[PDB]
Amino acid sequence: SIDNCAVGCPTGGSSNVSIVRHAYTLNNNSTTKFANWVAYHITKDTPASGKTRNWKTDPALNPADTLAPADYTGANAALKVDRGHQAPLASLAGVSDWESLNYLSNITPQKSDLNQGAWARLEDQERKLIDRADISSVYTVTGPLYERDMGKLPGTQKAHTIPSAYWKVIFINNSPAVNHYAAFLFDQNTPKGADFCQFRVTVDEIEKRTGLIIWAGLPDDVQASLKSKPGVLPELMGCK
């Protein structure tokens, strides 16, 4: 049994069924054509560097409900976006189904300045947590916001909705009921040189802005107590 969430995968996604892989668990949105959320579990055995990026349509989805590689033609020139990972390649590419990290269900059109800047620096610190001797797991949920019109990919006729922002909710080891946690939220237009430490939020803000309940297996009291309180995990990620 594959559990990429530990404390219950998010509720509230547009799809009632999620895709469960070793690399991640994902909840697709057939309207937006992107994942509502992607949950993953970093351990000492999951990172692998230098994997290549053969983008592919997710074979587990109906092709009408997701993007294909052709759909990104011209996107960078039109919109200054990259094919941005939701579950991060280098942190997870040691798993047995790693090629699924490059399925387009795990990709969105993410502004290059965000993808290559603060989002990447956050990914690097998130991955670095697992090197600590007393951290045995990092459990993350990531996903988009859909709050303003960001334009359309020129290379497709499909209806789709480019995200306006991206968020990441992280905890270590067992459960946020007992372990340090973090949440971050970045607009698409985040400057390239931005410090990811300046984008800390609460889990509650992300829930309000997505219609999701993250960590949905936690007791009610724990959810109510902790989700409105920003966490301290960022301090272990270099934030001061």
- The residues annotated as belonging to the active site are 85
6 backbone φψ class: left, alpha, beta (φ>0; ψ -120 to 50): left
Contact stretch for Mg ion (CB under 5 A) within 30-38, 107-115, 139-147, 180-188: 107-115
Binding-site entries: 115
**E-only strand ranges, the chain:** 19-20, 25-28, 35-42, 81-85, 107-111, 138-145, 165-172, 181-187
Nearer residue to Mg ion within complex by CB, 126 or 207: 126
Q: Is 227 in the site for Mg ion (CB under 5 A)?
A: no
**E-only strand ranges, 43-114:** 81-85, 107-111
Minimum distance, C-beta of residue 16 to Mg ion, in the bound complex (Å): 28
Nearer residue to Mg ion within complex by CB, 29 or 115: 115
**Within 77-96, which residues bind Mg ion (CB under 5 A)?**
84-85
Return the residue of 25, 29, 115, 125 that touches Mg ion, per CB under 5 A: 115
Are 231 and 239 in contact by the 8 Å Cβ rule? The answer is no
Binding-site entries for Mg(2+): 115
Beta bridge partners of 140: 40, 170
Are 35 and 29 in contact by the 8 Å Cβ rule? The answer is yes
Minimum distance, C-beta of residue 107 to Mg ion, in the bound complex (Å): 9
Nearer residue to Mg ion within complex by CB, 90 or 183: 90
- List interacting residues with Mg ion (CB under 5 A): 84-85, 115
